Amino acid sequence: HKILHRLLQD
Amino acid sequence: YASLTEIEHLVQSVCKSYRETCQLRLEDLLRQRSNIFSREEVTGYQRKSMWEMWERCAHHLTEAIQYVVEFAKRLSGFMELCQNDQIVLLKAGAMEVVLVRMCRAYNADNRTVFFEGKYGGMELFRALGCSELISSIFDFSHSLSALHFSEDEIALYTALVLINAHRPGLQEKRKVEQLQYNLELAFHHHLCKTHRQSILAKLPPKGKLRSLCSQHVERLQIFQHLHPIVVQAAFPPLYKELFST
Ligand SMILES: CCCN(Cc1ccccc1)Cc1ccc(NC(=O)Cc2ccc(S(=O)(=O)CC)cc2)cc1
Numbered sequence: 450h451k452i453l454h455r456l457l458q459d
Numbered sequence: 460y461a462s463l464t465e466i467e468h469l470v471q472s473v474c475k476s477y478r479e480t481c482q483l484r485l486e487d488l489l490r491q492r493s494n495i496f497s498r499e500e501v502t503g504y505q506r507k508s509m510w511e512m513w514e515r516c517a518h519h520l521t522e523a524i525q526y527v528v529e530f531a532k533r534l535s536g537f538m539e540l541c542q543n544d545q546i547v548l549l550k551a552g553a554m555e556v557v558l559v560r561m562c563r564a565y566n567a568d569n570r571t572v573f574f575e576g577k578y579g580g581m582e583l584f585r586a587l588g589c590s591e592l593i594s595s596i597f598d599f600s601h602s603l604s605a606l607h608f609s610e611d612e613i614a615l616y617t618a619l620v621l622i623n624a625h626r627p628g629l630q631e632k633r634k635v636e637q638l639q640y641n642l643e644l645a646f647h648h649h650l651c652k653t654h655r656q657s658i659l660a661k662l663p664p665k666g667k668l669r670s671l672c673s674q675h676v677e678r679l680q681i682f683q684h685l686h687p688i689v690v691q692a693a694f695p696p697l698y699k700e701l702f703s704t
Contacts, residue, residue, distance in 0.1 A: 450546045452700045456528050457538075457545055 461641045469535065469645040470615070476533040477614030482526045485563055485610060488573055492566050496579040505585045510689045512586040513682050515575070520557065521695040527556045531621055536638040544635060547628045550701060552621040554675060555668045558599065559617050562608070565600035572600065589678040592671075599663070599671060606658050615646040620668070676702055 461469065496504070504512070531537050531549055538545070564573035571578035584593045608616065619642050624635040650656045679702050683690045690699065 450550065450700065452697045453528075453546050453549055454542070456525075456697075457532065457542070457549075 461644055466641070466644050466648050469641060470611075470649050472535045473618050473642070473645060474611045474614045476530055476535070477617065478610070480526050480530040480533060481610070481613075482523060482560070483564070483573075488564050491573060492571075492578060494577045495569070495571060496577045496583060500577070501579060501583055504579070504583050507586045509586055509588055509682065510686045512584070513686070514689060514693050516584070516587065517694050517698050519574075520554075521698045523557045523560070524553045524697065524701070527553050527560070527621075530556070530617070534618060534621070536641070537622070540634055540638070541631050543628075543630045547626050548621055548623065548635070551626045551672075552623060553701060554672050555620050556617045558596065558668060558671055559603065559620055560613065561596075562600045562603035563613070565597075565604055567601055567604040570597060570601065572597070587678075588682070589674075592674045592678050595671060595674065599667065602663065606661055609653075611649060612655070612658075615642070615649055616662070618642050619646060676704065680704055 507515075528549060531545070531552075537548075540548070561572070565571070566578055569578075569580075571580050574583060581590070581593045581597045584590070587593065606612075619639065622635065622639045622642055624632055624639045626635075629635055647656065647659075650658065683703060690703065
């Protein structure tokens, strides 16, 4: 789940 | 133990998060209801290739999903959940929240949905080759339209659609159960103030949202087997991650 993980950062 | 004040603050917080991430203004959607695709324009869509129509619809869904991701990130309690559970909830729930949000863009009077600048019927989507799924989605939007949700009710209901403690794969189910319960109290409290608790018994039954999501995944499989290169070349990576098997 690379993309979802990235979206949840910040 | 969420106090009355804490529940009231949770209501406001959920409504705020939704308002900031609702995608299209309701007033704009409603005023556009008079703008309906012509027979010629419908024909044009029906003559599009399967691949182009899927590609367009995949892009539009991904745009909607990005707003739902942001909604989750701004939903109080959500970012406090463990990372695994955040992902589990969004992977299962993102499409379910879009499907619910979609009823805003659905006109029950003529069974049309807002798509690429105008309102069109389910026959607009014929080139997809998944007309039962489209018909089921229209039916679903129609069932929700009969409840005539306010924006605040959509906010609180979609919060519960997302924060679903029954999702398989949750590692900290208790924390999800607790947030889910507080959201239920917020929902019930708001409905009680507005004399709208009657709608609770009329909400989409168990398994309905799951069925629409499963069919979407299945119909994507069918398309992807027939057009593998297009999905790899052109589909949004988020769409592939959420829905490609
Ligand atoms: C969303 C489910 C229906 N959909 C099925 C499908 C999706 C992807 C591949 C194959 C089938 C078809 C569909 C997709 C998009 C649209 N319309 C729009 O995206 C325009 C729109 C509508 C509503 C809003 S909103 O503000 O109310 C938030 C969702 C925002 C933009 C229609 C059908």
